[PDB]
Amino acid sequence: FQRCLDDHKYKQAIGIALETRRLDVFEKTILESNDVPGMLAYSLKLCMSLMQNKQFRNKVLRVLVKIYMNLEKPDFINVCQCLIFLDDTQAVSDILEKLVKEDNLLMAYQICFDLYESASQQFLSSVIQNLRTVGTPLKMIKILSGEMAIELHLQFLIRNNNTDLMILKNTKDAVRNSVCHTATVIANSFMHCGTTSDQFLRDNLEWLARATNWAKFTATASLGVIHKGHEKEALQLMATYLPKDTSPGSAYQEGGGLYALGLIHANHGGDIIDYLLNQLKNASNDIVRHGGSLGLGLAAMGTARQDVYDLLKTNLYQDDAVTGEAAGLALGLVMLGSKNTQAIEDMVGYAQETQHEKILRGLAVGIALVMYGRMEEADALIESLCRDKDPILRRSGMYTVAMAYCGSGNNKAIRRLLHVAVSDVNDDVRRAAVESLGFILFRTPEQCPSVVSLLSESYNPHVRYGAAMALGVCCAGTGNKEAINLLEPMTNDPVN
Amino acid sequence: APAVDTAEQVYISSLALLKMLKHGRAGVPMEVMGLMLGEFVDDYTVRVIDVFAMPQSGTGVSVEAVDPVFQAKMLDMLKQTGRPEMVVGWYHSHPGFGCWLSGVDINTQQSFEALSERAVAVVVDPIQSVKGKVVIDAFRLINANMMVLGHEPRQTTSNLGHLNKPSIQALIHGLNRHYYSITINYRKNELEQKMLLNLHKKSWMEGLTLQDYSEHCKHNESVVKEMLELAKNYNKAVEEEDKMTPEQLAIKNVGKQDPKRHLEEHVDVLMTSNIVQCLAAMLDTVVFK
Amino acid sequence: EVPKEKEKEKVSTAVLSITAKAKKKEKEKEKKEEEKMEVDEAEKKEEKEKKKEPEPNFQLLDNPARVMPAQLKVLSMTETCRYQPFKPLSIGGIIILKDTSEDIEELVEPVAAHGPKIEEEEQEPEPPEPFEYIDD
Amino acid sequence: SFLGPEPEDLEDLYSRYKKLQQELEFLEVQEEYIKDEQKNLKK
Amino acid sequence: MALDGPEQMELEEGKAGSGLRQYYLSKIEELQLIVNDKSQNLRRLQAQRNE
């Protein structure tokens, strides 16, 4: 180690440290302000990709922010990488304190914005409070809330009108009224996210009315995507579908509207949390409240507070079905981010206990959602859900491991899933193994098509479904040529 | 045409499904029916716990086939068991036809629909079946117009759906008019699964058992004698078989009725048979004394 | 592209071809001393545009990147350069000092909002827009 | 071997291969299970 | 690489420490052989199942 130091090779130094799995050797003396920018960031990345050892990765990240901060120039891209995994309040907090003295407010604003997007949502709510106590100047703190971030993007999307209207026109002109009209409304809405398209709404009012059942609820809900984060004309036009203004129409339309209201506010939801929370408590019934609770959860997403969860917990105990599915989903959305002991215990038993099918679906996905980056606790949950009488619970268990593990691969999680699927000809498990891969293998994004090439051959339509879903998630941001070709035969196969 | 309906997902229990197979095989070819007992849970799920039959008649799958006498009689007794169950619907079998309902059968489905609109007719096929996955379909049964308009997929939501063809275009058309295949899920678990697994505890005696030595000799003789006959073709087989085209090979080197397949098959029975008999005789000797 | 707009172009195309071909074919001139040929056939077709590529870009995989070393500048709140994710080397280029925004935080460059110190140098103005608050 | 650029080239090979090794651990786990899946195909 | 030969001592520049890299590669090289055997084996089972 002394001998590499003499040569001054930053690269050799880190490599010997990397193999030894020792902190002392790693701790810098070849980057104590010896060419400050660039070099730290490669090393963090390497510790993630190369290792599957949680202990080495966490120690190296923590110490590194604190020494780097001290150097002539801190560089933030590296500090964000340490922070998202650990979730430490300190890392961001120390970096901003130096920045206050030099009076370089902009430098700080830049970090806050990035943090919103990348880091775990619950961690983001806590820091806002924390900065006031630490004593950093409000302007940075505003950006860190993220209320500013969404709006700055919104400003661009709305004004430029980035999504073309033309694409939506072909879909509306071409397609008939059947199941097909319901479909169209969701299609245009999803493409034209973050910019207003009232033109579609008013014109094809008729189509919304024609639909019956849950499908009618779904059409009205799509309005909520189009009008995402706005509060100008967007709100006005949406108001009328909700009971808020004229023509609320049928019951399904009222609920798709309250849901669309929540979806627009989503995870900036604070003002909306009081309004929604109250409606759901008093009535604890109806289509209209089912859409509200759905909306309440999305708005609340991440701060992991006990209050909202507890009020929702009762609605499950009361066991009214319609609302039940929305409250079930919602537990998972608020706690999202990091482990919370009460959510894991009440949802496992309650989901297992009920034979109310939609309560069973809501509650089932919700157990997976609460985990993220807490690997080991999930190993327990998944086996128990798989053994049960309910088919749904088997698929939810996969989700549980996928999330807890997403952070770094391991051998453990893939191995667990894999044995169940081969052993038996059971469909529900067989899809589960293959599905689960994409989330965990995320670190080297090539790998998911490697495992899935053998699995896509399977004649079970289940496996074939599960192979496609997995490829989708892993490759999403950084693509692969191999992933594209695997999807083609699934499209071809005639099963639905 | 507009109406606000939901589809019924039929959750069939393991106990219930097996009884439906039992009844349907028995009825052959004459079509037979019965009522389904269950519970209505959630906002669409009708679950079939158990099934009983209404009488076997050549007037089967009819309103007539339905017996008021059976229904009352069972229900008083069921009160005592500590399960008086709801009539979730009715099952029938067609072993003269597929999943296409008969003309009487559509009226009969309707009468059940009046009593409880969460009523379905499940078609059970055991010799008009093309699949060993258990050819069963579910219908609520709604009018023709609903298909034509395209209303019928708006009502079904909360369905996946599926389409199979036991018997041609005529069946497909009948299916589309009805309500097509609405999803069947199964309520099953490992305890029920273990019951079905079984064969014989008698395996206990049998693993140890071996036969008279004269018999061991009969087997060995019969196989060696057999092997002589095929051997003469085998010579040709190894000398030639440049052909890889199955039809030409068959005529040329007696490729069909192949000496390789059969001679291998023969060495393998003889070896395994001798091993288990021999192995058991020796094991028993040491242990009993 | 909108169905109605293109429907106009097709219709126009078809009327000229059919009308001209109708007179041209029927006329008799070959036998005549005028000789412009008894038959003359008249076909006109349209073309549609294809995907545009102004000045080369480098395409690898499905493309989570796509660069060229020769630079142009583009404005903020006007990303019409519709980035692929994981290109840090193209956003801000390799760090700006040609602009008001001078990096004092080096090569941090997210593909989302980068606004470093605007007080180091001034090479151009910076209107504030209250528009994001309005939306809010 | 030296202090020279020879250990720089070796380093880059080393680095990339190490990342690969992890990839390969996963392929071993599948190889073991495929044996049981083949046995299962028969059923 | 090199057969033999010390290049500017163990102590002076610290040739041995950088030098250790070449030997760590002997391990990855040793692994490269099994990977090949492993590839064929996996394929034979896969081809077998696939048919």
mmCIF file of N, CA and C in Angstrom, chain C residues 62-114:
data_model
loop_
_atom_site.group_PDB
_atom_site.id
_atom_site.type_symbol
_atom_site.label_atom_id
_atom_site.label_comp_id
_atom_site.label_asym_id
_atom_site.label_seq_id
_atom_site.Cartn_x
_atom_site.Cartn_y
_atom_site.Cartn_z
ATOM 1 N N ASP C 62 -30.253 1.235 -27.826
ATOM 2 C CA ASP C 62 -31.539 1.812 -28.064
ATOM 3 C C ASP C 62 -31.300 3.314 -27.983
ATOM 4 N N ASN C 63 -30.223 3.670 -27.296
ATOM 5 C CA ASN C 63 -29.703 5.016 -27.043
ATOM 6 C C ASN C 63 -30.150 5.561 -25.677
ATOM 7 N N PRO C 64 -29.349 5.361 -24.595
ATOM 8 C CA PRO C 64 -29.447 6.157 -23.418
ATOM 9 C C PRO C 64 -28.268 7.200 -23.510
ATOM 10 N N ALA C 65 -27.716 7.327 -24.705
ATOM 11 C CA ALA C 65 -26.932 8.509 -25.003
ATOM 12 C C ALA C 65 -26.855 8.741 -26.416
ATOM 13 N N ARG C 66 -26.419 9.894 -26.913
ATOM 14 C CA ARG C 66 -26.392 10.226 -28.289
ATOM 15 C C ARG C 66 -25.765 11.606 -28.377
ATOM 16 N N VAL C 67 -24.443 11.628 -28.841
ATOM 17 C CA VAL C 67 -23.669 12.885 -28.769
ATOM 18 C C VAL C 67 -23.019 13.223 -30.047
ATOM 19 N N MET C 68 -22.472 14.443 -30.197
ATOM 20 C CA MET C 68 -21.537 14.798 -31.302
ATOM 21 C C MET C 68 -20.584 15.776 -30.713
ATOM 22 N N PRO C 69 -19.306 15.850 -31.004
ATOM 23 C CA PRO C 69 -18.365 16.764 -30.408
ATOM 24 C C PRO C 69 -18.608 18.191 -30.826
ATOM 25 N N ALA C 70 -19.206 18.503 -31.997
ATOM 26 C CA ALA C 70 -19.454 19.825 -32.509
ATOM 27 C C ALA C 70 -20.728 20.337 -31.767
ATOM 28 N N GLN C 71 -20.655 21.572 -31.077
ATOM 29 C CA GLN C 71 -21.631 22.041 -30.133
ATOM 30 C C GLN C 71 -22.460 23.102 -30.773
ATOM 31 N N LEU C 72 -23.710 23.216 -30.242
ATOM 32 C CA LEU C 72 -24.576 24.316 -30.457
ATOM 33 C C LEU C 72 -24.987 24.575 -29.037
ATOM 34 N N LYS C 73 -25.527 25.823 -28.797
ATOM 35 C CA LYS C 73 -26.075 26.236 -27.506
ATOM 36 C C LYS C 73 -27.513 26.230 -27.622
ATOM 37 N N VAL C 74 -28.176 25.842 -26.471
ATOM 38 C CA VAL C 74 -29.636 25.920 -26.356
ATOM 39 C C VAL C 74 -30.031 26.555 -25.039
ATOM 40 N N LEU C 75 -31.188 27.318 -24.982
ATOM 41 C CA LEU C 75 -31.722 28.000 -23.831
ATOM 42 C C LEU C 75 -32.377 27.145 -22.833
ATOM 43 N N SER C 76 -32.388 27.732 -21.571
ATOM 44 C CA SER C 76 -33.016 27.092 -20.433
ATOM 45 C C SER C 76 -34.448 27.515 -20.310
ATOM 46 N N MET C 77 -35.264 26.454 -20.060
ATOM 47 C CA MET C 77 -36.735 26.485 -20.038
ATOM 48 C C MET C 77 -37.197 26.287 -21.382
ATOM 49 N N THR C 78 -36.333 25.729 -22.282
ATOM 50 C CA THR C 78 -36.468 25.452 -23.700
ATOM 51 C C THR C 78 -35.572 24.284 -23.924
ATOM 52 N N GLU C 79 -35.738 23.149 -23.200
ATOM 53 C CA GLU C 79 -34.990 21.960 -23.676
ATOM 54 C C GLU C 79 -35.731 21.365 -24.856
ATOM 55 N N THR C 80 -35.271 21.622 -26.027
ATOM 56 C CA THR C 80 -35.755 21.118 -27.252
ATOM 57 C C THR C 80 -34.706 20.154 -27.744
ATOM 58 N N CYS C 81 -33.639 19.901 -26.928
ATOM 59 C CA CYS C 81 -32.563 18.933 -27.054
ATOM 60 C C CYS C 81 -32.902 17.578 -26.396
ATOM 61 N N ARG C 82 -34.159 17.409 -25.974
ATOM 62 C CA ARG C 82 -34.783 16.185 -25.432
ATOM 63 C C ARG C 82 -33.848 14.998 -25.188
ATOM 64 N N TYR C 83 -32.947 15.135 -24.179
ATOM 65 C CA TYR C 83 -31.926 14.311 -23.635
ATOM 66 C C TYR C 83 -32.381 12.881 -23.326
ATOM 67 N N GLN C 84 -31.414 11.977 -23.408
ATOM 68 C CA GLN C 84 -31.535 10.594 -23.055
ATOM 69 C C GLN C 84 -31.001 10.592 -21.589
ATOM 70 N N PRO C 85 -31.361 9.653 -20.671
ATOM 71 C CA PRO C 85 -30.914 9.859 -19.332
ATOM 72 C C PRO C 85 -29.522 9.369 -19.322
ATOM 73 N N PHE C 86 -28.711 9.804 -18.322
ATOM 74 C CA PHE C 86 -27.277 9.439 -18.247
ATOM 75 C C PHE C 86 -26.549 9.983 -19.432
ATOM 76 N N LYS C 87 -26.561 11.347 -19.562
ATOM 77 C CA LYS C 87 -25.631 12.037 -20.378
ATOM 78 C C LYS C 87 -25.271 13.218 -19.474
ATOM 79 N N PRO C 88 -24.091 13.254 -18.890
ATOM 80 C CA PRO C 88 -23.707 14.374 -18.044
ATOM 81 C C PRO C 88 -22.775 15.300 -18.727
ATOM 82 N N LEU C 89 -22.317 14.757 -19.898
ATOM 83 C CA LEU C 89 -21.183 15.194 -20.670
ATOM 84 C C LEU C 89 -21.655 16.139 -21.724
ATOM 85 N N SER C 90 -23.036 16.291 -21.857
ATOM 86 C CA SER C 90 -23.718 17.024 -22.881
ATOM 87 C C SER C 90 -24.526 18.106 -22.274
ATOM 88 N N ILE C 91 -24.967 17.898 -21.004
ATOM 89 C CA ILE C 91 -25.670 18.950 -20.276
ATOM 90 C C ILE C 91 -24.637 19.894 -19.650
ATOM 91 N N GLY C 92 -24.571 21.166 -20.084
ATOM 92 C CA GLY C 92 -23.669 22.165 -19.628
ATOM 93 C C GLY C 92 -22.369 22.055 -20.452
ATOM 94 N N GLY C 93 -22.477 21.113 -21.466
ATOM 95 C CA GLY C 93 -21.510 20.490 -22.233
ATOM 96 C C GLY C 93 -20.595 19.710 -21.259
ATOM 97 N N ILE C 94 -19.290 20.053 -21.390
ATOM 98 C CA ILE C 94 -18.334 19.842 -20.375
ATOM 99 C C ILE C 94 -18.285 21.304 -19.836
ATOM 100 N N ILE C 95 -18.632 21.494 -18.594
ATOM 101 C CA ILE C 95 -18.852 22.745 -17.791
ATOM 102 C C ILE C 95 -18.593 24.038 -18.526
ATOM 103 N N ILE C 96 -19.618 24.956 -18.365
ATOM 104 C CA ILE C 96 -19.757 26.296 -19.011
ATOM 105 C C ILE C 96 -18.932 27.310 -18.286
ATOM 106 N N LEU C 97 -18.274 28.253 -19.086
ATOM 107 C CA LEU C 97 -17.778 29.481 -18.544
ATOM 108 C C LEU C 97 -17.993 30.508 -19.626
ATOM 109 N N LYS C 98 -18.836 30.132 -20.685
ATOM 110 C CA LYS C 98 -19.141 31.049 -21.742
ATOM 111 C C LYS C 98 -20.375 31.879 -21.391
ATOM 112 N N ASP C 99 -21.016 31.526 -20.231
ATOM 113 C CA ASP C 99 -22.356 32.007 -19.884
ATOM 114 C C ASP C 99 -22.213 32.667 -18.612
ATOM 115 N N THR C 100 -23.337 33.278 -18.174
ATOM 116 C CA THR C 100 -23.441 33.931 -16.841
ATOM 117 C C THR C 100 -23.180 32.957 -15.704
ATOM 118 N N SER C 101 -23.841 31.818 -15.806
ATOM 119 C CA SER C 101 -23.694 30.633 -14.941
ATOM 120 C C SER C 101 -22.292 30.106 -15.099
ATOM 121 N N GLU C 102 -21.419 30.263 -14.033
ATOM 122 C CA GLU C 102 -20.054 29.747 -14.043
ATOM 123 C C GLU C 102 -20.089 28.677 -13.025
ATOM 124 N N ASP C 103 -19.484 27.480 -13.349
ATOM 125 C CA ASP C 103 -19.431 26.432 -12.418
ATOM 126 C C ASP C 103 -18.459 26.725 -11.364
ATOM 127 N N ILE C 104 -18.897 26.494 -10.084
ATOM 128 C CA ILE C 104 -18.031 26.530 -8.963
ATOM 129 C C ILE C 104 -18.072 25.196 -8.289
ATOM 130 N N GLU C 105 -19.056 24.310 -8.728
ATOM 131 C CA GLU C 105 -19.328 22.926 -8.414
ATOM 132 C C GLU C 105 -19.137 22.274 -9.745
ATOM 133 N N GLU C 106 -18.118 21.428 -9.789
ATOM 134 C CA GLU C 106 -17.539 20.942 -11.013
ATOM 135 C C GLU C 106 -18.004 19.568 -11.412
ATOM 136 N N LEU C 107 -18.660 19.438 -12.574
ATOM 137 C CA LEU C 107 -18.998 18.258 -13.398
ATOM 138 C C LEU C 107 -19.995 17.398 -12.668
ATOM 139 N N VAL C 108 -20.808 18.117 -11.801
ATOM 140 C CA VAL C 108 -21.871 17.581 -10.986
ATOM 141 C C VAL C 108 -23.043 17.340 -11.879
ATOM 142 N N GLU C 109 -23.223 18.297 -12.844
ATOM 143 C CA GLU C 109 -24.181 18.337 -13.987
ATOM 144 C C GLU C 109 -25.218 17.249 -14.121
ATOM 145 N N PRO C 110 -26.303 17.271 -13.281
ATOM 146 C CA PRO C 110 -27.469 16.406 -13.528
ATOM 147 C C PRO C 110 -28.064 16.768 -14.874
ATOM 148 N N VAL C 111 -28.810 15.852 -15.538
ATOM 149 C CA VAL C 111 -29.604 16.147 -16.763
ATOM 150 C C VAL C 111 -30.874 17.013 -16.393
ATOM 151 N N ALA C 112 -31.254 17.227 -15.087
ATOM 152 C CA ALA C 112 -32.318 18.034 -14.572
ATOM 153 C C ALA C 112 -31.652 19.374 -14.150
ATOM 154 N N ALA C 113 -32.217 20.088 -13.125
ATOM 155 C CA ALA C 113 -31.888 21.480 -12.934
ATOM 156 C C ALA C 113 -30.549 21.778 -12.403
ATOM 157 N N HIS C 114 -29.755 22.417 -13.283
ATOM 158 C CA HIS C 114 -28.408 22.857 -12.907
ATOM 159 C C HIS C 114 -28.453 24.378 -13.106
#
